[PDB]
Design a protein around this ligand. Structure first.
Ligand SMILES: Cc1cc(/C=C/C#N)cc(C)c1Oc1nc(NC2CCN(Cc3ccc(S(C)(=O)=O)cc3)CC2)nc2ncccc12
Ligand SMILES: [Mg+2]
Lengths: 556, 414
């Protein structure tokens, strides 16, 4: 008998104030009972469970499921009630590695660690709560009562405690074998390395020898996976990687469930397929909840879906990470608040691709969106690679310098350089800092009656020019923007505009180049046509000349 | 330091479960070396999956230093930790600290690692050293001693701290000593030549009565902290635009000051005039401007600090490295206003300038009132959250919210 060191148990408690489960055992047929008795007898020989007396007051129901592939019954202990009462654990598998961050590992060996999957000991003080009862034949005998000695398949803490225990076991081997790569996936250990094929299996036998210290016999998994690895939705080849085949269905009746799976496939494919757009397609599920409702496809959605089918026509592949080379990210504008990017180290060979959709707002500009896209890529790159990439951006150095030195918010993008890939991000208008000498001065104002929704808007100028327009179904804020629009429409190339609208100032001082409001877009179109525009603010109802004259003209 | 003080959380509150944000490889490598040494020294120990709590951690470099430092964001744990009452229920803030002419800030956080932590509370200090690309699980630790950045650390070491300083206090009774978190604020009215040498007298006191960062000493001068009262222009010829902005500024100040009148100045705006036209001042307007100018000389009335309310700090970007700020609890009742310029290290980086500005305003708020303010930052959330840790150098972290609408009162603090 070769001594094996024990696996340390994790202390486990129930939630404070709660007790163990006490669920009634469901009635079972005579064939299911005989099946569970033979199953639990085998498990008891292997020490996985143990018979208990009548004093244990806890119980969870056990069931018997049969599969079609093999004509055998299977045991299923329903731990839904125990899990609701079990403490929270530190789940050490919230995320998975992205393939674009993995280094090339020549040789990979798969090991079966199922011998330890059902062999991790459970906290002795907690086994009371895992009790279950096999009903007896015709209920004429007290049922057989068992409790778990190892981590039960289905219990809340089984995945966390197992991975923690395996990690503690493997820690000394990995530390003293830095040229070895180990990844845990259910009952399979993936051990890879960049060593020659001879020295690789040498360290694999050393890993078998280390794992035997805990009595864990780990043979090579039978029927080892042929390349590529089909894992978590990817295709892991020894030198390339891609997503599993993305095929777009060609249907005539498109329901919202078809689009939820369509955008899901498009989002999943956008991490390697460059130029994928999902705006007009996901635009159709703004507030839909009925998963079976059919929605017509807009001409913009059909045109967008057609662009994706051409992109998804030919499969593309990504490369693996080389730490010795620089990390480079490049962004392109696609329109309608859509951006796409590629991350690479060598040209024409991408590590991965991606996309960014603009946040839902009322007013926006390309510079703000490009900045948001940069921060997203920056955060994603630190996740995947642990560093910030060099950026290639479609915006002039002068354009960025002018933007951030004049923007009212603090802003910053990391090390970047200009790439002349149209369409380029541009500043479409820039207001003046001082009043314009020789330019006509428009005093604007608007007003509306909240009850009747009737309003007026217009201007008065220093040259005697005047206009007042009657408006129906309007608001105070709406007539204030309309008044500014009228002043831009009827002025020359240079104009000074004087308003008292704090609302209009806040919109214009945000410097948008596109808006959900049609009136704001018309103002932007007018601003782009001008040479110089100075926008001045004054307090309202303070006897200010010109402002008070047009205020009396618009208030009816 | 044998026994541990029994501490707990607030009634009906659980431990902190805050997500660890990503870190660069250089900062992960630094945290691994730091935590390996702390583990050997017994300061921290590894934890298992039965501990579901987490508190974020990252690595910084203090001002004028080369080696990394571990910084733990205990903000969530601090607000969930019970309020501390010692043999004294509370100390009022020393109002003389802000009156001294020189205040040196000394990091004394290393003195906390000699006092053990209550074994029932250690699980709540859990933190994770993240891994790159989820390739390995995060290295999970918890604290065994009083941790730097936790509000209970000075509130437990305070009994021991009063005795270490007792010899130095008797020798110099005119020296104000105040402690906030990991820092020690020592103020006096003597010259820097006598101050710097006297400051090092306290450095060897921690060496004898008990550190890596004990050598550094941040020097402040609260006697030379500038105030920003409301000022009006002094011109000889006023354009229509000059008077419009003047009336606008005076109308804004009328919310703060009683008796501000703009009637005679509004009379000068005679209908629709070109913005660049010079308007002569009348006698009625000059006296109105003069009366308003005398009003703005006096401070605001009914302006008091309330220890129960929060301190709010707003910041405006004025351009060319200039930033203005105001500290208040009620709107239009500033307890402190100021302006910063020539931010060191950042003349092409807005975020680094704002980051240094937040740290300086927080330091002033600690010296004056003994607590940190809630910041209203002129920056989009995604940009600030991505980069502020890259420029942070203080051992504490304030709260903050994000302003997404341009303020109009900016041009009036300029
Ligand atoms: C080892 C491992 C396996 C899987 C999934 C398996 C399934 N299902 C997933 C991950 C994340 C994982 O963990 C890590 N993987 C890597 N590198 C990858 C890069 C190449 N791929 C593709 C490949 C090459 C060769 C062959 S073969 C049959 O021998 O021809 C077959 C496939 C495998 C190893 N580096 C790592 N570094 C640090 C930490 C972990 C690393
Ligand atoms: Mg009006």
């Amino acid at each position: 008998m070769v001594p094996i060191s024990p696996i340390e148990t994790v202390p486990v408690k129930l939630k404070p104030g709660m007790d163990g489960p006490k669920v009634k055992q469901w009635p079972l047929t005579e064939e299911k009972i005989k099946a569970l008795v033979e199953i639990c007898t085998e498990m008891e020989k292997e020490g996985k469970i143990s018979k208990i007396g009548p004093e244990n007051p806890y119980n969870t129901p056990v069931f018997a499921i049969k599969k079609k592939d093999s004509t055998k019954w299977r045991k299923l202990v329903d731990f839904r009630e125990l899990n609701k009462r079990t403490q929270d654990f530190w789940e050490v598998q919230l995320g998975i590695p992205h393939p674009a961050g993995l280094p090339k590992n020549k040789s990979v060996t798969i090991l079966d660690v199922g011998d330890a999957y059902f062999s991790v000991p459970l906290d002795e003080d907690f086994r009371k709560y895992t009790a279950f009862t096999i009903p007896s034949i015709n209920n004429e005998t007290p049922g057989i009562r068992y409790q778990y000695n190892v981590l039960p398949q289905g219990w809340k803490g089984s995945p966390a405690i197992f991975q923690s225990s395996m990690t503690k076991i493997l820690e000394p081997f990995a530390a003293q074998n830095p040229d070895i790569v180990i990844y845990q996936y259910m009952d399979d250990l993936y051990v890879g390395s960049d060593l020659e094929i001879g020295q690789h299996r040498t360290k694999i036998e050393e890993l078998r020898q280390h794992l035997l210290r805990w009595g864990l016999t780990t043979p090579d998994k039978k029927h080892q996976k042929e390349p590529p690895f089909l894992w978590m939705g990817y295709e892991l080849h020894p030198d390339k990687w891609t997503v599993q085949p993305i095929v777009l269905p060609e249907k005539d009746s498109w329901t919202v469930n078809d689009i939820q799976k369509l955008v899901g496939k498009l989002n999943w494919a956008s991490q390697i397929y460059p130029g994928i757009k999902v705006r007009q397609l996901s635009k159709l599920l703004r507030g839909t909840k009925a998963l079976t409702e059919v929605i017509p496809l807009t001409e913009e959605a059909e045109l967008e879906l057609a662009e994706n089918r051409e992109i998804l026509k030919e499969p593309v592949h990504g490369v693996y990470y080389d730490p010795s080379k620089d990390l480079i990210a490049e962004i392109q504008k696609q329109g309608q608040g859509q951006w796409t990017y590629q991350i690479y180290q060598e040209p024409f060979k991408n590590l991965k691709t991606g996309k960014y959709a603009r946040m839902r707002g009322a007013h926006t500009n390309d510079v703000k969106q490009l900045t948001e896209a940069v921060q997203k890529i920056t955060t994603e790159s630190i996740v995947i690679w642990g560093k910030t990439p060099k950026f290639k951006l479609p915006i002039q150095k002068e354009t960025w310098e002018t933007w951030w030195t004049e923007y009212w918010q603090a802003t910053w993008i990391p090390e970047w350089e200009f790439v002349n890939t149209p369409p380029l991000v541009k500043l479409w208008y820039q207001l003046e800092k001082e009043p314009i000498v020789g330019a006509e001065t428009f005093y604007v104002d608007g007003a509306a009656n909240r009850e009747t929704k009737l309003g007026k808007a217009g201007y008065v100028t220093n040259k005697g020019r005047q206009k007042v327009v009657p408006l129906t179904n309007t608001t105070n804020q709406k007539t204030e923007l309309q008044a500014i629009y009228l002043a831009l429409q009827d002025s020359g190339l240079e104009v000074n505009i004087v308003t008292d609208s704090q609302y209009a100032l806040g919109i214009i001082q945000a410097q948008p180049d596109k808006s959900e409001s049609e009136l704001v877009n018309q103002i932007i179109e007018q601003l782009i046509k001008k040479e110089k525009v100075y926008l001045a603010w004054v307090p309202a109802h303070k006897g200010i000349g010109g402002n008070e004259q047009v205020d009396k003209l618009v208030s009816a | 330091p044998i026994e541990t003080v029994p501490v707990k959380l607030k009634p009906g509150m659980d431990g902190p479960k805050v997500k660890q944000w990503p870190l660069t490889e250089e900062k992960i490598k630094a945290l691994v070396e730091i935590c390996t040494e702390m583990e050997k020294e017994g300061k921290i120990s590894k934890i298992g999956p039965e501990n579901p709590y987490n508190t974020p951690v990252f690595a910084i470099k203090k001002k004028d230093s080369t080696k990394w430092r571990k910084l733990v964001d205990f903000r969530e744990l601090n607000k969930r930790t019970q309020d501390f009452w010692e043999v004294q229920l509370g100390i009022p803030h020393p109002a003389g600290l802000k009156k001294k002419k020189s205040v040196t800030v000394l990091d004394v956080g290393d003195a906390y690692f000699s006092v053990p932590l209550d074994e029932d509370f250690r699980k709540y200090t859990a933190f994770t050293i993240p891994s790159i690309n989820n390739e390995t699980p995060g290295i999970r630790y918890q604290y065994n001693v009083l941790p730097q950045g936790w509000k209970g650390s000075p509130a437990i070491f305070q009994s021991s701290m009063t005795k270490i300083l007792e010899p130095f206090k008797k020798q110099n009774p005119d020296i104000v000593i105040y402690q906030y978190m990991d820092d020690l604020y020592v103020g006096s009215d003597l010259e820097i030549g006598q101050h710097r040498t006297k400051i090092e007298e306290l450095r060897q006191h921690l060496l004898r009565w008990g550190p890596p960062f004990l050598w550094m000493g941040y020097e402040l001068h609260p006697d030379k902290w500038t105030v920003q009262p409301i000022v009006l222009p002094e011109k000889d010829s006023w354009t229509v635009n000059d008077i419009q902005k003047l009336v606008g500024k005076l109308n804004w100040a009328s919310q703060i000051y009683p008796g501000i009148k703009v009637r005679q100045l509004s009379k000068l705006l005679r209908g629709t005039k070109a913005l660049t036209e010079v308007i002569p001042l009348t006698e009625e307007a000059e006296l109105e401007l003069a009366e308003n100018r005398e009003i703005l000389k006096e401070p605001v009335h009914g302006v008091y600090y309330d220890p129960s309310k929060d301190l709010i700090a707003e910041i405006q970007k004025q351009g060319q490295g200039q930033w203005t700020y105001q500290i208040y609890q009620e709107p239009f009742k500033n307890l402190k206003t100021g302006k910063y310029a020539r931010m060191r290290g950042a003349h092409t980086n807005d975020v680094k300038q704002l980051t240094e500005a937040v740290q300086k305003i927080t330091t002033e708020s600690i010296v004056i009132w003994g607590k940190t303010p809630k910041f209203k930052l002129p920056i989009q959330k995604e940009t600030w959250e991505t980069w502020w840790t890259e420029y942070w150098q203080a051992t504490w972290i304030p709260e903050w919210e994000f302003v997404n609408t341009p303020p109009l009162v900016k041009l009036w603090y300029q």
